[PDB]
């Protein structure tokens, strides 16, 4: 009956906790006691990009570290050249409410999604000067939150119906569906080699998957409320998360438990964006405070602040060469720091 | 500057020239959100208002005195609404329709109203409140099968306010019942506010035609308030 199954589940959880206690012989803050602090980090704007009429809700870089893409809630998708502050493309959408965007590593396509439960794909290299829609992907049952390209023919999506999907573009149908969450899913991050990826939910849970087989492998807990952002450490052996309880944490995929927690006593608001740097010695985080904070990752102290936004910060990004940082916010502006 | 840079600047100017036309059309339209429950008559007012003219969201366009109004109704979603409600923090108003002929569900509606009133990102958004289905209430009160004081004890100690205007010529029991629930809503409205948003109650039925003019007249009042507060006069 259900009683025996629940008792077995409780025993399994107890065994898991017992096996997780005896794997922790040291604390990171003790091994990292002799590390030199990085100093004080001061940054200042170099470009301010204007042109949007409403909130800016997502952004993404390109493999060439010169081009950008930005998405707003008035129905616009803009492609920027950040060196000279030009405008290369402005694409209108069909639904105003958009929540994600992305380049493909080949510099040929973009994609977006939102409240209407569709993912739209746009071609950039037509013979004429006009950009048109190449494909529309339908079949979710809840608002999409994030999407990331793999090749020019494979995409991965996350929705508010508690499921993740893998899509083949030319055919136009799913090849694998990932089920297992209890709440909504909020953020994703693909691996450097593109063989596994991580997802966090509106529960205090996160998971790791396998794109080929199509199954869950490890589950991590520890937070107290919803999980808002997630990303990968450069080597693919860690990931850092932030939650709507004024706390960030760091997780590993072999010890299967926490290693650091970033928080304070004057911080009583949540986290919206999380982004690493090229070496792993900086962790940048966004708040509705309305600031951005720069955390040393190996000692859990603040080493810098970034101010200048009049409203909530929603997005954040770094480049593939390490030269700039781009920040957007609900006040309709993007700012570049170096 | 070589030829490539010239061409780049020409294209950028040609793009700004179109964004300047997009600004006006974006700014000349107003956005509204529509909320209710499964037994509220939400779609009937939409059908009536369309005379003035799978999927995760719908849209309806109507026009009053050469002013263009957009209305949005949500669909194909789950029952948890604490992540996609953050998208509607720049609308002119929120419309809230409530069924006032089923005594077994009004407590749920009150609890749904409080969470909207006291949310963080919706503290500058006003509400237009429709108390639907006043025809059914008349017969349910006159007939005498159900007792209103069995779901709410305080009704045993209530007197009609002297500012009430029972124009139609009805049985006073109907007026007591009508105004009790509006007082129940306006208590929550008045208690925790801070002078930054308001509430507007109305009595509707399934055969009214005047539901566009009221939204028009209330949106004027909202905008006038915003303009006066931006000068530090209110």
């Amino acid at each position, epitope marked *: 009956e259900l009683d025996q199954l629940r008792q077995e589940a409780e025993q399994l959880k107890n065994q898991i906790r017992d096996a997780r206690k005896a794997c922790a012989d040291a604390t990171l803050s003790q091994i990292t006691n002799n590390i030199d602090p990085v100093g004080r980090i001061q940054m200042r704007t170099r470009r301010t990009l204007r042109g949007h009429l409403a909130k800016i809700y997502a952004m993404h870089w390109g493999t060439d570290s010169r081009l950008l893409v930005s998405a707003s809630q008035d129905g616009k998708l803009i492609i920027w050249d950040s060196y000279t502050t030009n405008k290369v493309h402005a694409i209108p959408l069909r639904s105003s409410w958009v929540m994600t965007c992305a380049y493909a590593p080949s510099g040929n396509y973009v994609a977006c999604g939102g409240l209407d439960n569709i993912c739209s794909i746009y071609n950039l290299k037509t013979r004429e000067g006009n950009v048109r829609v190449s494909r529309e992907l339908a079949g979710h049952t809840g608002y999409l939150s994030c999407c990331r390209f793999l090749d020019d023919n494979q995409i991965v999506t996350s929705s508010g119906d508690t499921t993740c999907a893998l899509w083949d573009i030319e055919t136009g149908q799913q090849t694998t569906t990932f089920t297992g969450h*209890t709440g909504d899913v909020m953020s994703l991050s693909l691996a450097p080699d593109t063989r596994l990826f991580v997802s966090g939910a509106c529960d*205090a849970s996160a998971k790791l998957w396998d794109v080929r087989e199509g199954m869950c492998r490890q589950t991590f807990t520890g937070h107290e409320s919803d999980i808002n952002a997630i990303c990968f450490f450069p080597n693919g052996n860690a990931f850092a998360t932030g939650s709507d309880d004024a706390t960030c944490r760091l997780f590993d995929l072999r010890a299967d438990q926490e290693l650091m927690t970033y928080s304070h006593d004057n911080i009583i608001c949540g986290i919206t964006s999380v982004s690493f740097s090229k070496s792993g010695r900086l962790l940048l985080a966004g708040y509705d405070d309305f600031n951005c904070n720069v955390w040393d990752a190996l000692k859990a102290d603040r080493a810098g602040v970034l101010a200048g936004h009049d409203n909530r910060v929603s997005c954040l990004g770094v480049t593939d060469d390490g030269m700039a940082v781009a920040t957007g916010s609900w006040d309709s502006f993007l700012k570049i720091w170096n | 500057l070589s030829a490539e840079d010239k061409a780049a600047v020409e294209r950028s100017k040609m793009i700004e020239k179109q964004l300047q036309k997009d600004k006006q059309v974006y700014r000349a339209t107003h956005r509204l959100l529509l909320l209710g429950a499964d037994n509220s008559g939400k779609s009937t007012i939409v059908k009536q208002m369309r005379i003035y003219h799978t999927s995760g969201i719908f849209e309806t366009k109507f026009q009053v005195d050469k002013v263009n109004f957009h209305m949005f109704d949500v669909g194909a979603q789950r029952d948890e609404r604490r992540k996609w409600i953050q998208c509607f923090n720049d609308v002119t108003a929120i419309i809230f329709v409530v069924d006032s002929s089923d005594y077994n569900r009004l407590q749920e509606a009150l609890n749904d109203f409080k969470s909207i009133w006291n949310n963080r990102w919706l503290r500058t958004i006003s509400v237009i409140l429709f108390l639907n289905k006043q025809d059914l209430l008349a017969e349910k009160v006159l007939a005498g099968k159900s007792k209103i004081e069995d779901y709410f004890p305080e009704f045993a100690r209530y007197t009609t306010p002297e500012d009430a205007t029972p124009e139609p010529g009805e049985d006073p029991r109907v007026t007591r019942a009508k105004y009790f629930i509006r007082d129940e809503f306006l208590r929550i409205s008045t208690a925790s506010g801070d002078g930054r948003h308001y509430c507007y109650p109305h009595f509707t039925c399934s055969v009214d035609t005047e539901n566009a003019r009221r939204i028009f007249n209330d949106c004027r009042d909202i905008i006038q308030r915003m303009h006066l507060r931006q000068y530090e006069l209110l």
Partner: nanobody, 127 residues
Framework: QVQLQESGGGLVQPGGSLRLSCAAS????????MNWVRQAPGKGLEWVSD????????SYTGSVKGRFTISRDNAKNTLYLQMNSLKPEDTAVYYC?????????????????????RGQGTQVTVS
């Protein structure tokens, strides 16, 4: 890992009394608002009683306003409910409920079909 475990059910004559106790584990207990919910045999999820972060705001549904009493104890991490003169229409299954966020007054998604911060429940029968 949020845990909320209930205790104190049973069978009682009409007019009797009993005490419900919820124990919590896995969060700072004093930052969060708390609630009570019940599921009557044949209906949806209802709402009964409320309490605030400190212990100085209290609120009830209409029909339990003379009989049931709510309290919390931040030191022992426990939420309480006492009932005095029971009627047969109180037979149900009883859950405690948290709020999604800390330091707030709005209470979203407590009565939904699926929701992550909500105990398993306890059965109360009156006859």
């Amino acid at each position: 890992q949020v845990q909320l475990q209930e205790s104190g059910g049973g069978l009682v004559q009409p007019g009797g009394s009993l005490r419900l106790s919820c124990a919590a584990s896995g969060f700072t207990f004093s930052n969060y608002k708390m609630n009570w919910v019940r599921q009557a045999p044949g209906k949806g999820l209802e709402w009964v009683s409320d309490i605030s972060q400190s212990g100085a705001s209290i609120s009830y549904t209409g029909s339990v306003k003379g009989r049931f009493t709510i309290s919390r104890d931040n030191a022992k991490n426990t939420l309480y409910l006492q009932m005095n003169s029971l009627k047969p229409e109180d037979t149900a299954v009883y859950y405690c409920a948290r709020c999604p966020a800390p330091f707030t007054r709005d209470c979203f998604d407590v009565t939904s079909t699926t929701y992550a911060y909500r105990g398993q429940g306890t059965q109360v029968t009156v006859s």
